[PDB]
């Protein structure tokens, strides 16, 4: 054990941080009035509609 | 493990963030008399209308 021949030190280290996500919304809030365009065998409605405003410039 | 043989050190980063988003929005208020220049076949009104108002310079 002279001469510092078994003397040591060591060190060490590991990180490691990983992360993620994601998100999504939609709203919508009004009311159209459509008209039934063909009348299914199990007599549900199919319906279209459309709304044209110009206000101004637009 | 001498003269700094296996003596490491490394980093590393990754980031990412991304967005988006959009939106729409309207109103109209008033009250507007319009006449009927049609009946459908199931007897629904076809109705049409304008109102013209000069105040001033326009």
Same mark, same amino acid.
């Given at each position: 054990? *002279? ?16 992360? *993620? ?5 939609? !709203?919508?809030?009004? !009311?159209? !009035?459509? !008209? ?23």
């Amino acid at each position: 054990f *002279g001469n510092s021949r078994a003397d040591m030190e060591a060190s060490g280290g590991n990180s490691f941080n990983g992360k *993620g996500g994601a998100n999504a919304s939609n !709203t919508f809030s009004g !009311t159209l !009035t459509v !008209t039934v365009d063909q009348v299914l065998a199990n007599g549900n409605l199919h319906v279209v509609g459309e709304k044209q405003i110009a206000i101004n410039q637009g």
